[PDB]
Amino acid sequence: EDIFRKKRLTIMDLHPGAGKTKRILPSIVREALKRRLRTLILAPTRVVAAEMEEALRGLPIRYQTPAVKSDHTGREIVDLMCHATFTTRLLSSTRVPNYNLIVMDEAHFTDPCSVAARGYISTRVEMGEAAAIFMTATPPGSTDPFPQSNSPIEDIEREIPERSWNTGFDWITDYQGKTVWFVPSIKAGNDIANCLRKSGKRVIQLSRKTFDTEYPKTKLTDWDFVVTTDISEMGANFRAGRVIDPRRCLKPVILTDGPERVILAGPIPVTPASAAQRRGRIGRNPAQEDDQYVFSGDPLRNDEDHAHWTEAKMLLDNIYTPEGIIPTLFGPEREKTQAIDGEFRLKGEQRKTFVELMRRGDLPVWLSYKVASAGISYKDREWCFTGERNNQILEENMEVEIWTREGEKKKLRPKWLDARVYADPMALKDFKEFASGRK
Ligand SMILES: Nc1ncnc2c1ncn2[C@@H]1O[C@H](COP(=O)(O)OP(=O)(O)NP(=O)(O)O)[C@@H](O)[C@H]1O
Ligand SMILES: [Mn+2]
């Protein structure tokens, strides 16, 4: 009603399962179409976008790939894209439309590109150019781990194995229904999934990189356990009876004591918002009344040292605005770290390189910023090899060595050390491909 008025930013914070995605958003879109508004819908991931455009099956929805920088048809159409696609387009295009209504679904997503998107959108709204709707059961500052739900949930607090077990946890395997198990890391998930698989359990693993291909498999009944990272907090719909949640995550932190680096701290306790979102995967079905949330430990609200707050600013400082509008993070997320105006603004080829390192090289934001602001070209991989001794990367205790594009053998020893590029087997493989200049 007033939600369509420019300069309004609405936080739709109805409880998990309430129907924000599948009933309320469709209504908003049908009404936006009636008012002839230029509408953008943002989904956390590709497969969720795919689920969104079936809830909107009657309507003129156009999914937008990030392989395309802009797509203007000149017709009445509603654009649908991932959070990251939007921020990627803002970094590389000028022809980003003046959407006057922007809905972010699952607006609790704390991935840097999502935080950056919210910052951008809030500013567009404040300019009087747009109205905006952020949809999430857990907006910034959320502290209630046990929000209301469609059907009753049994909250069971008990010990949960961190790794492979052999005895003392019969309740895990004797349970008769389907379970979603949130683990802090891919390695932790690998361990757990293999322990369950030896007992004859069918397991699907989910992480950020495999979500788009693995998540669809969970839509079948041909499984017993899902073992997932925090990616499933973003609007993932499961038909399950139980969540297991030791409430642990890894958190990237930029250390500034001496040589600046990114570590993965933890496992540490999750935020209340994360715990609520994990719990909120169950109790979704009014017909199904004895869902369980099995958990361990209390949340920790203070995530102020999380790298993602800085990284969002790095992105935002490089998305262009009129003069003199200053880029800024949205709402209370603005208060996570100290803002410094223009701190991360890059110019010329340094900026182009920054974007390319993230897009083409699939490098973390901080790492890309570090390389780009040193005046290093995208294709110049020498920095992968010229780090200090403590930056030597190890795989199975042994020193990782790389055959380079030019037919040279070099020890993998990056000048800037970001723990995320070797945090797991797939991450390390990718970084090895990058260091060898095969992308
Ligand atoms: N594909 C589906 N088929 C049948 N029911 C579904 C399907 N997807 C979702 N649901 C149910 O539809 C109801 C509302 O879903 P939804 O619109 O995603 O709620 P929500 O508010 O977006 N949840 P959340 O994002 O966790 O806060 C829930 O009971 C879901 O379990
Ligand atoms: Mn939702």
**Which among 181, 146, 144, 145 has a CA at the least distance from the CA of 160?**
181
Q: How far apart are CA 180 and CA 291, in angstroms?
A: 11
Q: How far apart are CA 263 and CA 417, in angstroms?
A: 8
- Residues whose CB is less than 8 angstroms from the CB of residue 317 and which lie 6 or more positions away in sequence, other chains included: 327, 342, 343, 344, 345, 346
CA of 336 from ligand 2 middle (Å) equals 25
Q: How far apart are CA 101 and CA 107, in angstroms?
A: 15
CA angle 58, 85, 67 (to 5 degrees): 90
Query: Is the CB of 432 within 6 Å of ligand 1?
Result: no
Q: How far apart are CA 285 and CA 242, in angstroms?
A: 12
CB neighbour class for 351 (10 Å; exposed up to 12, middle 13-18, buried from 19) = middle
Tokens 């050390």 map to which residue? Answer: 417
| Longest distance between any two alpha carbons in the chain, whole Å | 64
Residues 373, 346: contact at Cβ < 8 Å?
A: yes
Query: Is the CB of 283 within 6 Å of ligand 1?
Result: no
Helix (H, G, I), strand (E, B) or coil at 156: strand
Per-residue DSSP letters for 22-55? IIIHHHHHHHHHHTT--EEEEESSHHHHHHHHHH
Tokens of 406: 């030019």
Residues 389, 415: contact at Cβ < 8 Å?
A: no
Tokens of 217: 């498999």
CA of 19 from ligand 1 middle (Å) equals 6
**Which among 30, 32, 82, 92 has a CA at the least distance from the CA of 56?**
30
Residues 173, 201: contact at Cβ < 8 Å?
A: yes
CA of 128 from ligand 1 middle (Å) equals 32
CA dihedral (377, 381, 386, 388) in degrees, to 10, reads 90
Is 15 annotated to bind a ligand? Reply is yes
The DSSP bridge pattern shows strands 153-157 and 291-295 to be parallel
Nearest CA to ligand 1 atom 7: 237
The DSSP bridge pattern shows strands 203-206 and 225-228 to be parallel
Query: Is the CB of 237 within 6 Å of ligand 1?
Result: yes
Q: How far apart are CA 378 and CA 126, in angstroms?
A: 36
Angle between helix 348-359 and 83-92 (nearest 10): 150
Alpha helices in 142-248, H assignment, sequence order: 170-174, 186-198, 211-214
Q: Domain 1-142+303-340 adopts which CATH fold?
A: Rossmann fold (3.40.50)
The DSSP bridge partners found for residue 216 are: none
Q: How far apart are CA 23 and CA 27, in angstroms?
A: 7
Burial 265-287 (b: 16+ CB within 10 A, else e): bebbbbbbbbbbbbbbbbbbeee
Is 280 annotated to bind a ligand? Reply is no
Residues 422, 431: contact at Cβ < 8 Å?
A: yes
Domain boundaries, the chain: 1-142+303-340, 143-302, 341-439
> Do 1-142+303-340 and 143-302 fold alike per CATH?
yes
Is 387 annotated to bind a ligand? Reply is no
Residue 62 CA: distances (Å) to CA of 104, 132, 314: 16, 19, 29
Q: Which atom in ligand 1 lies closest to the alpha carbon of residue 16?
A: 27
Q: Domain 143-302 adopts which CATH fold?
A: Rossmann fold (3.40.50)
Helix (H, G, I), strand (E, B) or coil at 180: strand
CA of 235 from ligand 1 middle (Å) equals 8
Query: Is the CB of 44 within 6 Å of ligand 1?
Result: no
Q: For this experimental structure, what is the resolution in angstroms?
A: 2.0
Helix (H, G, I), strand (E, B) or coil at 163: coil
